[PDB]
Amino acid sequence: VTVEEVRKAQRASGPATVLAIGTATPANCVHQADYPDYYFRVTKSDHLTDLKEKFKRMCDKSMIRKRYMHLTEEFLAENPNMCAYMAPSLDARQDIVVVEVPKLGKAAAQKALKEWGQPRSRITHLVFCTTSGVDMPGADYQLTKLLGLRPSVNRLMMYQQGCFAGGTVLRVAKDLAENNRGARVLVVCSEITAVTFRGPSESHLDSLVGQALFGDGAAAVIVGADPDERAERPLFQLVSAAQTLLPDSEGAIDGHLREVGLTFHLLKDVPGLISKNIERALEAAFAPLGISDWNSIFWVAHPGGPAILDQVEAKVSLDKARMRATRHVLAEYGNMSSACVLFILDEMRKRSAEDGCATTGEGLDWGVLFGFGPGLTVETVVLHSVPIT
């Protein structure tokens, strides 16, 4: 009868908890050892032998062993506008991603739901995040139909976000789960590089870097507060989430949706900008918790490129073991934009079980998740591990 009464009956008690993770990728695998030859072949750029030597360096130094890509040679050969550096092609790219992004996210969400063990109808919110394609109704609507979620699911469609949004979706799901008693949030990031694939331009080497780094993939997490201990198995606790813009980082990471598709700009200051600011972000997150030793917490960081992990490592004097879960996902999947950190969370807890650690976070109790992206924005999520019996 009163709003205060509704607010007490509404709202949950405990902190947002990750209850399941699942991941999926296209079946087409592309090995980095073959990509320089493959890429310069299908883009009819073999005559640019000087540029091809540069690409061989980037692919050799990428610390990427393989990527999964929906795009095939057979398809590209039928789509020369997408193989040119810059040709009319947004319509052709949209036709792929508008169908394939929700399709890939469905593959990931099914695995998360399966491990969750609860009926799909219990899912109350859906947070769908992509950086490839836009459409009305959005990919959130398509996924809802594909999975058969209830029609009254509360959907949040995060479009054209960039690579920091892996942390964004957890910050979003945290407030949804925590403010709504019983809420169970399905979170899906799904990325498909058909929107960004393009040929090589000697005058835009930062775009060439994108071609050596970005890959396809989707990851799904189910987040909820007040877990049913009898039926749900917690993995991580979401303690706090923050976003920030880095000083003097204007223009560091740009991306425009145009008739030639999604373009990509990237300054060489990106590794320096992140490494030089990461400690301010760590202090902001962990000082109120009383934590100052960055080697005593587990680490999840978006692997924008190997140079970012190298310079964050050196700047903060991390032990090589702390970036292992991050470097493994980079090596085995490449840069999947917003889905990366969720993949790393999945790899963190799996290895923690296989190795016999005390917790899902490599035996450590507290952890941090970092997303980096256009802004330059940095998303920081404090995590807490769960004991492994």
Next chain:
Amino acid sequence: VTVEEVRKAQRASGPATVLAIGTATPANCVHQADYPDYYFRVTKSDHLTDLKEKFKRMCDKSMIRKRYMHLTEEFLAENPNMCAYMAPSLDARQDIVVVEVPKLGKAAAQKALKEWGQPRSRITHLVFCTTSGVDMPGADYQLTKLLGLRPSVNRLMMYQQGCFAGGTVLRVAKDLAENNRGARVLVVCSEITAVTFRGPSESHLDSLVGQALFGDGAAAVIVGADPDERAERPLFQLVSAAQTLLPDSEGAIDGHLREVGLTFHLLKDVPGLISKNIERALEAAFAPLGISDWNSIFWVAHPGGPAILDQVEAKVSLDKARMRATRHVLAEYGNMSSACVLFILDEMRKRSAEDGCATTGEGLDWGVLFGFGPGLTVETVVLHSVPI
């Protein structure tokens, strides 16, 4: 310190409350009575006389007296591909809205921030919503710079949502404010029709209807729980928020971002689907609260078109006064997509104050806000007014 201690010392206690509302439009104004001549002239389509008759009737029946459009005749004369029905023009349209959408948002945000009267640094969250254009970094980042908000403001960027997103942003802001002690959420919906404006085609009358209804505008709202009694002024309380998809509505409203810009497609009698279904949403939102008389609550409904309001009003036998503020915004502003319900909320609390109503909701205590859009999606936000 445990994670439990954090949660307790992290959350707010009270309900999310609307503390300030500001609106803004482009200055360039077009009266509907003049638009068929203007629209057919600038699109070089005066020779399709039968189509023009159809478009007059579209405009006559729209119940819109005027709309604001950033696009001017001088600009359009230099952009023939945007005046054609179907010509490559995404790049030009993007070039417009990527700059003008946050600019119009700051005009409304500055009004709301002035009414709120608190320092801009106190803003902790920003929810920016637009259906006109996309970009990385987004319009939320542009607005942060233009307003001098703190670099650490938590931004949510809602792109390509559609007309129902005026309710979506309140549903987002509700959980941000309520779950974070001290959080003050700036909510900005900004819409500019340069992405959908296109010439007429005789085989695409659904697109032509959009040319009759859609206008430009931006609206800003500041949301927080636990208001300061001396320094802040509650206008409305967000009680609950829900989203649903209507049965048998597949494909009723589709919109595709293509190389010719944002196209618009209708397929399944939108006024019938909303009114056939509105009572279910009312009962879902208000049966837990013991209300069943849909005339006992104030109404804010997204004015997608007059037919939606007519059939919904007739389905639940609404007194003509319940739809008044909604129809006034439709008449003086057109269909401004996500921003419409925020304009109506402002009109309602102002008109309730101009006249001597007891509450900000036209003298009533409880209220309902509806967003309608692609899905068919219905957003339902239960409101509670504030005594004047």
